[PDB]
Structures are given as C-alpha cells and as structure tokens.
Design an enzyme around this catalytic site. Sequence first.
Site, mmCIF file in Angstrom:
data_model
loop_
_atom_site.group_PDB
_atom_site.id
_atom_site.type_symbol
_atom_site.label_atom_id
_atom_site.label_comp_id
_atom_site.label_asym_id
_atom_site.label_seq_id
_atom_site.Cartn_x
_atom_site.Cartn_y
_atom_site.Cartn_z
ATOM 1 N N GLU A 134 0.127 68.414 -12.935
ATOM 2 C CA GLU A 134 1.379 67.791 -13.364
ATOM 3 C C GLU A 134 1.233 67.145 -14.743
ATOM 4 O O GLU A 134 1.389 65.936 -14.915
ATOM 5 C CB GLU A 134 1.864 66.769 -12.331
ATOM 6 C CG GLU A 134 2.295 67.363 -11.006
ATOM 7 C CD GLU A 134 3.657 68.015 -11.079
ATOM 8 O OE1 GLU A 134 4.370 67.796 -12.080
ATOM 9 O OE2 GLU A 134 4.022 68.742 -10.133
ATOM 10 N N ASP A 135 0.917 67.982 -15.729
ATOM 11 C CA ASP A 135 0.797 67.638 -17.143
ATOM 12 C C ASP A 135 -0.347 66.687 -17.453
ATOM 13 O O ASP A 135 -0.517 66.319 -18.616
ATOM 14 C CB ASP A 135 2.089 67.042 -17.715
ATOM 15 C CG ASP A 135 3.284 67.917 -17.460
ATOM 16 O OD1 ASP A 135 3.099 69.147 -17.390
ATOM 17 O OD2 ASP A 135 4.407 67.387 -17.343
ATOM 18 N N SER A 136 -1.140 66.277 -16.472
ATOM 19 C CA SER A 136 -2.343 65.539 -16.806
ATOM 20 C C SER A 136 -3.323 66.455 -17.530
ATOM 21 O O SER A 136 -3.236 67.683 -17.463
ATOM 22 C CB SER A 136 -2.992 64.952 -15.555
ATOM 23 O OG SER A 136 -2.321 63.783 -15.131
ATOM 24 N N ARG A 156 7.017 76.502 -18.196
ATOM 25 C CA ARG A 156 7.470 76.107 -19.522
ATOM 26 C C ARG A 156 7.496 77.263 -20.508
ATOM 27 O O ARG A 156 8.169 77.160 -21.537
ATOM 28 C CB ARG A 156 6.581 74.982 -20.043
ATOM 29 C CG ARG A 156 6.479 73.852 -19.049
ATOM 30 C CD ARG A 156 5.982 72.563 -19.653
ATOM 31 N NE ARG A 156 5.068 71.911 -18.728
ATOM 32 C CZ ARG A 156 5.460 71.171 -17.700
ATOM 33 N NH1 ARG A 156 6.739 70.934 -17.468
ATOM 34 N NH2 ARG A 156 4.546 70.668 -16.877
#
Lengths: 159, 1176, 10, 69, 45, 56, 48, 56
Positions: B788-790, B972
């Site tokens: 999660e975008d970490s 994305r």
Amino acid sequence: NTTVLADEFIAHRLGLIPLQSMDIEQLEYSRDCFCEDHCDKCSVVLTLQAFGESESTTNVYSKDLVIVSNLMGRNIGHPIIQDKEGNGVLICKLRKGQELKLTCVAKKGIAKEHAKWGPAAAIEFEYDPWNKLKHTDYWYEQDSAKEWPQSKNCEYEDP
Amino acid sequence: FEDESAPITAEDSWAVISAFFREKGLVSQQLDSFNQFVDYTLQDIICEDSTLILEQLAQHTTESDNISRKYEISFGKIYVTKPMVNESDGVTHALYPQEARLRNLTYSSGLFVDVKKRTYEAIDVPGRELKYELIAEESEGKVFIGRLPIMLRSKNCYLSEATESDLYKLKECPFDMGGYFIINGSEKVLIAQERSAGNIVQVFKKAAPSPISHVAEIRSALEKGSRFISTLQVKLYGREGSSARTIKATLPYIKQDIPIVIIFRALGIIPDGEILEHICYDVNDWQMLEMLKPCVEDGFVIQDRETALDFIGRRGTALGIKKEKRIQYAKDILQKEFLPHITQLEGFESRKAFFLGYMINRLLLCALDRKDQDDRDHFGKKRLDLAGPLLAQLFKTLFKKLTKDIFRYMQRTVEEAHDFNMKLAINAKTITSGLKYALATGNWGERAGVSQVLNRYTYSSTLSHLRRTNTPIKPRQLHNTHWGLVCPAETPEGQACGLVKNLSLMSCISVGTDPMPIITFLSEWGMEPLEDYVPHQSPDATRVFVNGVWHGVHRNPARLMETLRTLRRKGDINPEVSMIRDIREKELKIFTDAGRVYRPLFIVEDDESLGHKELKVRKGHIAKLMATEYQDIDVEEYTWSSLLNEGLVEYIDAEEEESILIAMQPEDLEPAEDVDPAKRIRVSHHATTFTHCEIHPSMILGVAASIIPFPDHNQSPRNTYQSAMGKQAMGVFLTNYNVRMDTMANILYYPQKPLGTTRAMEYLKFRELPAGQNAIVAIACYSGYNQEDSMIMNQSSIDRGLFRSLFFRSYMDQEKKYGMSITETFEKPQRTNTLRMKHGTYDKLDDDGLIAPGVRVSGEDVIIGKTTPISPDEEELGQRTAYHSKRDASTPLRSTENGIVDQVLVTTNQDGLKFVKVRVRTTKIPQIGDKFASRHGQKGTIGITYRREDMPFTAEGIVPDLIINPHAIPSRMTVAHLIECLLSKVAALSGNEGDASPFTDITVEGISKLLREHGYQSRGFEVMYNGHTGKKLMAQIFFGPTYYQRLRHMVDDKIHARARGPMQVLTRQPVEGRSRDGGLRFGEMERDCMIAHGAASFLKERLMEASDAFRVHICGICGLMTVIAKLNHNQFECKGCDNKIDIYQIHIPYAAKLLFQELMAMNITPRLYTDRSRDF
Amino acid sequence: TXPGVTXPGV
Amino acid sequence: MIVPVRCFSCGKVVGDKWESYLNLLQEDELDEGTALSRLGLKRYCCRRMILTHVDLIEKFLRYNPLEKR
Amino acid sequence: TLKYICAECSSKLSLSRTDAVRCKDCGHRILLKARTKRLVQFEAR
Amino acid sequence: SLHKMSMMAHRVKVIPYSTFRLNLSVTSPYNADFDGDEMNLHVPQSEETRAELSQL
Amino acid sequence: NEVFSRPEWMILTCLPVPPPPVRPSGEDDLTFKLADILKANISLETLE
Amino acid sequence: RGNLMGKRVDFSARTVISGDPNLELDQVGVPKSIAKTLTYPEVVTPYNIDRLTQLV
DNA sequence: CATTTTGCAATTAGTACTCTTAGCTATGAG
RNA sequence: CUAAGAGUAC
DNA sequence: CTCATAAATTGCAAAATG
Ligand SMILES: [Mg+2]
Ligand SMILES: [Zn+2]
Ligand SMILES: [Zn+2]
Ligand SMILES: [Zn+2]
Ligand SMILES: [Zn+2]
C-alpha cells in the site's frame, strides 16, 4: 569553517573516508573503555587543517588528514589511497582566503551501526549457475535459455 | 549540412528552441509586462486627465474686483529613477536586491513628476464671454509622488545589465531569473489573473423557464480612456413557441430593457429599411427578417429621432432633466456610456449603430441555430493580466486618489486664502502605501491572492510559480484551446483543480501596442470606411475588427491578409499582433492588446523548388544559430529575433490558432507518401494543407511536466500528480542560498541529474539544479512492509548519503518604538529584573541577545532575547517589584525543531531600529515516514529500512536503494516508471544519458537490446537472492536505477500529540494546530460514528471531560444560569426569584454555557429544568 | 420572499 | 554539490575518482562510458554515482566568501 | 566586545551595546555575528 | 470517517519509530493507504469508556 | 404562552448585556456594538 | 457545529500511518513519543500499587 | 367563473499542515 | 492574541 | 506635539381583469 559546505556536510564526508584497519583487533571499543571520552587505546585523533591561500580553487583531500594520537605502533588511522595521483578522496574545495580547521576522533565500528564502517563494498554471490537445483523459475517470453545471459560461472559446471 | 537550403530534421528544431530561450528566458512575460508598465503606461496614466482646474469666479459685489481666476495644475513627464532607500539619518543611497531582501526593505524606485502650475485671469463682465489670459507666472520642478516597487531584472533594475561575474559579485544567483518584487524583504510574485476579454460579443443560450432564450453581450471597455466597464446586453425575449419575440437591449443607466429599434431611431436611423440593413445583411435571408419584424412592429409607434431620444430620456433613471433637454441627456447616454470602446466623441452615431446591428445579427445567428453559442472556456476569449496591467489599474485608482486629494487641498487653501505649496499638497505616502499594501497582501485594491509569496522550495517550483495563472471563480476542464499555451497536466489536486494553470514552455503573453499604425495600414490598403458602408452594394464584404472595434469592411480580404502577414513577418508590425481571417463568417479580427497568450511556430511555405510543402527554416539558419550558440559558449550573431524578422518563425495565439493547420512533426507530416513493430502507431492524416509546424510537441508541457521522463508512457492523472509533486521536490532552489535569509530552505546533499533526462530540461537548468537522486530501485514483494505505497529504503544507502538534506529556518525579530523614548532593546533578560521570561533556557545567549553561529540549539531554547520597557512601581503576583521594568518579548526556537545556528544577521530597518534574523541549520536524514516519489506520481512513505545485508542482492552484489511494491504498477499504470528504470540502467551501464523526452522515437525494444548487449537480461529482470538465507528467489526481480524526489512532507513535522495544554480563551476548548500544541478535532461525523458504535459514555467523555466540562448553577424556579454562587461562603442566590435553597448545579460544556449566554443576550431564555413536567 | 425566504412581492 | 565519497548502494569509494574522470573527459577526449570503465566503475551503481553528479560547488565558489581572512 | 563581520567588506569589527551597526571601512549596514570560540561537536555519521 | 468501521478500538503496541502502525487488513475498513495518510488516536480517560470501547 | 413567551415581549425595551466572558478583549466586536448602542441611546435620551 | 456537535478534544494524537505485517489485526503501533505524551489516569488499587509505583 | 403573472439570496466532504499581513488616516486644537 | 488571505497533505 | 472624529431548493402576496 569559512567554506561553502555545511559543517555536518563535511563531517558526513569525513565519516565516509576509509581508514587503514589492519590491526583493528588491537584497538578497543570506546563504549567499553575506561577513559572519559576517548583515549589512545580506543581511538585515533586526526586533524584536518586547510587554508585557501591560492588564487585558484585548492582541493582539500584526505591525504591532508594527519594523525595526531600516537598509534602505539599499530597500523591504523591512515586514510586509504588508491589512485595514481596520490591525492585521496576530495573532501572539500576552497576559494582564495577560505579556511577550514577541524579535528576528528575515530573509533572502531562495524557496518551495522553505520554503513561508513563497511569494508565490504559489493560482494558477488552465486550458486548453481545452470539452475540445476531449480531454485529459480526463469521469467521468459519465448525461451528462458536464450533470453537469460549465461553467467561467467557457467563455464565451471557441466551443462 | 553541405546543402544550405536542405530541409531540417526533428533534431534541428531543438536548436531553434535554444535560440528562443537564449533571448526570452523562462520569465520573459513578467519582465516584458513590467517594462511596458514603466516605459509607457505610467505616462499614459499621468497624462490622461490629471489636469486639476479650479475656476474661482469673481463673486464681485462691486465691479472693482470683477476678475475671475483659474488655478490649474498639470502633470508633465514622469521620471522613474533607479531603486534607492531612505534612512533614519536621511542618507539616500542606491539599493540592491540582495540588500532589500536582507534589510526587509522594498526594492522600490522613487517616482517624480513635472508639475506645471498655471494661473489664468479674466474680466468678469456679465453677458460678455470670459476670456482667460496668463499672468506670466508660468512656474514649472519635479516632485516626489511616491515609490514604485521594481521587479528584479527589469529594465529599471540594477541586475538588468549585470553579467554572470557581476551577478556573482552582487550575491545574486545567475540561475535566478527575476520577474518578481521584493516587498518588505519578501519575494512576491504576481499571479497572472485570468479574465474574459473585452470588446468581444458573446452570445449564450438561456434556460427554458427564463423568458429570454438567447443573450448577446459585450463587456465594452476602452484602454485609452476612463477604463470603466459597461455591460451592453442584447436579449431575445420569448421562447420558440412564443409568437411575440421582441429583442430588448440593456443600456447602462437605464431602468428598462429598451427595444433595439428605439435605440436605432435614437442614434439617427429612422426608416425601417435602413435599420434592417444595419442589422441584417441579406435580403434573401427572409428568416432573419421574419424574426426581426416584431421589433419594428413594436417601434412603429415612434417615427422620429427626437421622439426616440425623448422616449429614452423618459426612461432615463437620473430623473433630473427637463423634457426639452432629455434629448441632450439621452445623447450623452448614447455618446459616453453606450459602447465606450468605439468612441467617446460625437458625430460617430453611425458607427455605434453599426456595432449594435452587428450584435443583434450575432444574437439572431445564434438564435436561428445557424451558429453554436460561444464557448466560455475558449482560451482565446480569455486574457491574462500580468504584473503590467494589474499594477496599471491599481496605480490608476491610487493616482486618482492622490489627485483628488490634491484638488481638495487646493480648493481648501484657495477658499481659506492660505499659502500654496507643492510639498504640502502631494502625499507620497498615498501611492507608496497603496502599492506596498496591494503587493504585500494578496488583495488587489484600496480580488485576493493576486500577489503571493514566491515559492523557493525548488528551482522548478520557483519557475512554475513565476509562470502561474489563476482563474477567479465548466472552467475546470482542460480545454482544447489550452494546447501549447498552458500545461495539459499541471494543476492542484484539491479545489483549485483546473482553476490554477501553468504556462507552456514557449508560451508568451502579449504586452500591448498602439493600434494606430495598423489602422493606418488598413486605410492605405483599401479599407472601406464604416461611415459610407452600404451592405446592399457590398454584400460579400469582409468586416475588419481591430481590438474588437469594428473599423470597416474590405472587398479583397485575401490580399489584405497576405500583406498584413508579410508586414508582420518583416518586422514592420509587432509580431505579438494576432490576425484572424474567418472565411465562413467573412470577418477579419486583429488583436493587439495585452494579455493574449500565444506560442511560436515554424512557418511552412509552398516551396515550388521541391514541389511540396516545407518549413521556411532550413539547415542554413540552423547552422547560423549553432554558430551563435557556440560563440556564446567571430561570426554575425543570429538570435531568435532574427528568425522572427525574416519570417522564419511566427507567434500564433488561440484566436489565430482556430484558423490554422499545424504539423506535429516535420519529418513525418511534410513529405508526401516493413516498419518497426515496437514503435507506437502514428497517422499521416492523408492531407497536405499545413500552414505552420510545431517546433516540438514536447513544448506543450509546462515547466513541471517537462521534468517527467516518458510522460506519454503514463496515465494522465499520474502526470498531474508528478507535476504538482515536483514543486514539493527537494533540491537546490538557488546557488546563493548561503547568502539568503529565507524562512525555510531544504537542500539535497547530493542532487544528481537524471539518468533518464529530457531535452526540455536543459533549458530549465534541471541538470544544473537537480531536485532528486538516482536510487537503485527493485520492484518486489520483498517483506510485506512495502504494501500500500509503502517503500523499503536501504538503510545502508541512507547512511552513505542518499537523500540526506539540509534544512534552514530563519527567525526575524525587530525592536519597535512604543513611543518617543520607549525603544526596545535586544539583550539577555535577567530573572532579577524581567517579566514573562519563557521557560526555555537563556544560557545560550551572550550579552547582545543573539546566539553566535555554531552553538547548538534545542527545543524551546531562547535564540533572540528581547525586552520592552513598562511602567514601574507595581506590586503583585508575589515577586513583582519596581525593579521589573522590562517585559520579556523573546523569540525561542520551535518546540519540535533543533539544530545548529547557521548565522545571525543584524541590520537597521526603514526606521533605523536594529533588527535581526537568526538562521538555524539542521540535517534531515530520511526515516520511517518520509514521503518519496518518482517522477511518475509514485508517492509513498518509507515502510521500513533494511541494512545492506538484509536487502535482496543480484549476482554482482548490488543491493537496491529502494524496494517498491509491484502492486503499484498494475492499478496505477505507471509504465513510464518501468521504462525509465530500464533506460536509466542502460544509461548507467553505457555511460550515455537516457533521452527520456516524451515524443521521441525511443522504444522499449531498443533499450532492451542495448541492455542485452551489456550482459543483462533485456527486460531488466535480475536473479536476486534473499538477504536472510541467500537462497535464490523463485521469481526474478525488476531492478535498476530510477530518479526519486524527497518531498517536503516528513513525519517529524507531522507527528503531534496532546494530553493537556493551552486552551482557547473564548470557548475554553483546546487551541487549533500543532504549532500551538493544539488538540485534534473530534468532528461531527466522528461523534456520529461513536453514536453508531453505541458507546454513549465514551462520547460524553470525549465532549465533556476531554474538551470542556463547566459546572454552572441554575435555579428550579427559572431555568436560567442567573445564580450568584459563593462557594467558599456556601451561598447560592438567584436574584429576582427571591430563592436561596431551590438551586441546582449542572455540568455542561463551556461552549454550551456560552451559547446559552448568547441566547439570553439575544432575548431568548433557554430555561434548564432538572425534572419532567410532562410524560413521554 | 426576501430574497431569500422579492418581498413579497417584487 | 560535490562528488560523494562512496557509492550509495554498494559503497565503493568514488570520491577520489572525480578529478581523474574530468581529466579523462577533457584531456583524453574519452567518452563517459570508457572513462567510467577506465576508473574501475564496473557496476552501474558506481557508474550512476559518478556519471550523473553535478558539481554545484564551483558555483558556490564563485561568490566572494562571507568570512575572508 | 562581541565581534561582527561586514556583509560586503568581510571586515571584522567589535561592537558594544551603544554602537550603531555600520561597517567602519565601507559604511554598509548589514553585519553578521562571528563564529563562536567554544568547540562544537558533530557526529561524523 | 464515513462509517462506524472507520473508527475502531485497537490495542496499543509501543514501537520505536515515528509512525502509527496498523495491520494491512484493517486498512480496508479505514480506507487507508501509506502514501502520506494521517490518522487520529483517542485515549479513553476512565475504566467505563475503556471498557465499552473494548467491548463494543 | 402566558408565562414563558408573551407577544409583547417580542419588542425590546431592556437589552441584556452579556458579560465580558461572552465578548473577551482591543475590544471584541460585541463590545463595540454595545458601545454604539449605548451612544445612540444616550443621543436619543438627550434629544428627548 | 463548531463547538458543540464537534469540538477539539484533548488526549488525542495524529500522525502518518505505515503498514506492519507483523502486527495483529486488533493491534495498532503507537510511536514511543505519542505514548509518552498521551496519558491514562489509573486509580490506585491494591492490585496495581506496585506497577504504578514503579511507573511513578 | 376563470385564470395569471411575477420577481432571487442562503446553503450546501472531512480533517490537517505551513506562511504572510494587519489592525479607522488625516486634520483640528488645547 | 484575533481576523483575513495564500499555498499544501490525505 | 498627540488624542478625538469623519446546482437547486424555497418561499407567494399582491393586482389586475373581463
Ligand atoms: Mg492515501
Ligand atoms: Zn579509551
Ligand atoms: Zn431564577
Ligand atoms: Zn556502487
Ligand atoms: Zn564594509
């Protein structure tokens, strides 16, 4: 420090300077030493003193790092020089009239506490170049053998 | 090369771009507009009116003194000097910008005006006309009327002619571009304000319920006049089903919508045929005549010009004119208020009648479904007021104020017969304070956010701010006309999305020129005058518009357009002038006013020698431009102005861009018609009628979006995110950051130019001032800590200097004169004789009240010691005596921050009182929580940091600097991230630089082949080994260098907790913000969630104990809180009720008590009762 | 009403 | 600002290979890749460390020093 | 007294509380405090 | 905090870094990513609020 | 209502003055408005 | 709406959130600083005299 | 007995961060 | 201290 | 010389007639 670089910037650059550590086992960690802050049995004191007395830029290298503490006959403290020119790492630059005087205490350290103590650089590590153990599933588009270049170690095992 | 006139290639055009940016620069529009304002518009403001005449009549009781005087003050030429500063001692000396910034001064140059005081006298003989003559006292004498702030690098700035060595000498960054003001030591930039253009007729369909179906309007305004807006609207009453369709116009200062025929007969056009000819141009167009018949049938009651003027005067809202003079009054309404942009004089009634007929014609054409309603978002219908026009209108208002004050003073001193002086008349404070306030605060008057603090977090941020446009408020949509004039994807994600825009790289804004030469050209070249234009005898006539003023008609518009184009292409006409030929409407529109946004384009001609269309620019001009650039880096100089002068390049705006065809690239669209499957699909358009050529498609992007590598390989929202995120990127904003005392500065230790770099980013000096680092990124689900975008940043890479940064913060502190001898003093406050000394330690200050550079400072430690005198001889608080005459006004360090004090700067302000700026430097090392992002919108925080041994490693021992989750790629669709990682790998291996420009012929196949030639897997995968066990990973990891930015959002500046602390004085609630140790909001919907959870006691604890619990007393007789309580004496009493034992206490929020008090103060009694008087 | 909540009327 | 001492990823000391790199680029007219190979930078981590460095310190050294002795 | 440096001359001056902040050599009005004499400790990491 | 699941009682685990740390699953009710999101923490100040918070 | 809200109480004759807690202090806006009200009241009273 | 329906409250913190696969579903990671700031009042009881005494 | 017609402002995702500016201007009179 | 404004995060 | 004042919802009572 009348240079253009920040004080801790230069301290950061200095921390990354490799130092000779042949007899580092003869040294002691400062944390388990009996002195107050740092002594001869657990540290090496260097001093970088530079001045911009030249009308052109004068490059403060690591060869100008001079050991102050008496090394007691060990082989530690010396910055490591590799290039043919003889000047070490380019620590800083000085315009005319700029002056940079500073002192460094150097302890023994491992790469875990900070990567500046890492003597290892890149360590190539490979096993089974032919993938005989089937520990990898080779991603491919048409053929895994052709699209994956053979390693140099493939010559040391039977295909 | 060998051939001088050979066609150019796609690579050649970059040379042209280089030449352009050699002459313009990135902020050419700001400097051009301000230079126009100083050079010409100030004199126009001064000369227009500003001739104060005061005619003192004789008032002769006896004929002895029958002499009438007239005192007039005239303003001649205006002189603007170089910037200078006054002083406490009065010594005035030249002021430099890197003195104004440091001393909190304003980089302002004084203005002077030549005042001519004339006096006339006449003999006051009744009946005989007065004849005024001079008394030979023609005294003239420059006077100081204020100070105009000067934008940096402008023609009236000291840095305009400075060379690079001179800029270095003056402590001015050569990379600094100027185009901004210094107000009180702060860099203020004027955002280009977007507005609707003037003198353009726009027709709009209205809603069905409204009785008007279509509305045609003009926002008329004259530039060389009073500059007042009169919105003439022509509305078509009645729906499609309505049979009585009367067209009505809304004249200014008129209470009713006068029918159009009444206006036409008022101007002097009585017969129906003449009115219809003035409105309709085709006799066979019986549809328009049928729609127009209601108007003439309505106005048939009037058959005379005097009758129509009397009708208008009767409807005149002034209601102060006699019947015979209403005519004259109506004339005034039809001369100076109706369409001011046409003319303000008389004898041009026919011209305004023609323009009214044209407006009605446009309205009918829009209503007859013959044309679509005008698009409100069309960028050619919008004008951007830059610093020039904004300061022009502000100074117009401000100088009107000053001259009205002058007239009032003159009238007062002549009525009171006191002495007259110029110095006692002019108040330079008026202009000076007005300009300084309107520039210091965003409010542009006496709109908001016109002037903003210049963003200095990053060089690209500064550039984008200096090329920013703001639209006051479907305007948010990216319109088609935005192509090449504003960045397609650069706009904030929040409420400003689309309203805030950024200019394209090559887009410029016109500054405005005098349109008289163009009118002379038109008249010479056969423009038929509009007075004798009879449409019946010239039906197929093309109407010529200059700045929206219909000036005439031409019968051969083709030759006229050709010669106008030639004159503009040979330099005779200013190239900013835009000329449009709408053949279908048969109209010619010339626009020269300021605000228009245009872009440069290559010119394409027939080129009979090659038999096909070709660019007018050839290899010879490219060679000359290359020679000039190399000489800069002896031959005749060749600059962008030379291309503009020999018709090599052109300026086309969105108005002219409607009637042109543009070739996207020359090498593929000009020549007339086994292909690489890896190349993207492109079309030939099967058409050869091109008029211009894009210099390069990559120029449609703005400054921030020109940094993105492979933006055409990304989802557009990702490009928008990166455009808005690179302004938050951390780099080197200026090379002279060491001599600037800015409030916040963040600098990368080791900014690296991108391995994948674009051709448009060496005009932005990105390679000189990079804003990121090349980190070795692996895309792997390594540990589950990058979900999660970490991200997983390599801790050993951080230790060696990746993304490490310097942070400078400056605290400013002045000493202010409370009175004549109440001066503040910077000092080390002493606990013996000081009040309100902060709990922070003062031990770090020496005697002068400032911490010398080098001394470490921690949270709450005092860095600025200031005290102010107070009245002595007071005793209270236990330890307050007459000795405590000094109250502490110190400024400690931030509670959270700490670091080494970099520098302190002492100087004298405008009043001469010493003030200081303390700049403190600390080190921001990346840690768990800092926000990093690629150049593709891949924002994310550091989930965890692993040392070098724990990271996965290739067979060559390389460990990644970053690990990012694979899951960010599919959703994305940031394919450009992968392509740029591959290109960076190839570039680092081969030593070249990746050409990551958007629209090049660079394919993933070619990059993969080059990578395969270097001994690596062609698709960038590398067999990696788990760092914990060394076993090969069953899946091969995508691996390679990639360009990442460290963003300004660090976790150290966002962590915030508060168990208890300061409260609000009004509502007795915690204060707001982490800068005040405030409390977090327990909002409405949080309360609603706690209600849904059913936890009532927790909700009560949240709203009472945690925020404000107030015990208030009431009485059972009247539920009001009017109970006087004496708790120590144990006496409760509500006056009026005459009770002392019928009291209760309740626990209500202090906000509730305050609400009830404000209700009672507003004549409402919220009686509170503690028992049930009714059943449920 | 008002406006809002002309007049009435006008 | 000034050439980093060590490559970020692996840690090869590359702070002493900047002036040699510039001399190779200038005097020997070698292209970037051959010079990088000559200095011993075989891994693209070190090659990107030395290749893309921007020597901002020259700029900083153009301004007259604030404290001149 | 405590030392300062002219922003332009780079000249060193010593200023008391009552002294007006100017550079004796050139008359510039911007002065910067001198570096402290006490040693400062930096961790080389 | 659009629904009751976007406000839930957790158990404190003290960690030696500067960010709130939560399980990956429990992000789904909160609609929480880790790309700069911020979250709020409320502490009950009595045994009753503590108890009903843990039990509801 | 007979007791709580009679119609004649909709016309103001004795304006309540909220305490400074309602309008803490430069003065608050309500303080200035009450000052203006008192000034107008004194003007009308003196004119009467 | 600004001070009664929703109001600013004490005993609350706010910061950035990061994932942690090694935390239970009902657990939340709390920074040591936030734990050192936010506080809970625990009534002294014969059953918790020792640990609260040690905390004091 | 049956229509009929007309003129417009207030209120409308949550929090959260940072910084900048300004506080009735000028004139009379004790 | 308050108010206004601007920019920004999710 | 310094203090005091100049989108979309709603929510109708008229005024006129034959
Ligand atoms: Mg998020
Ligand atoms: Zn020791
Ligand atoms: Zn009572
Ligand atoms: Zn390396
Ligand atoms: Zn000097």
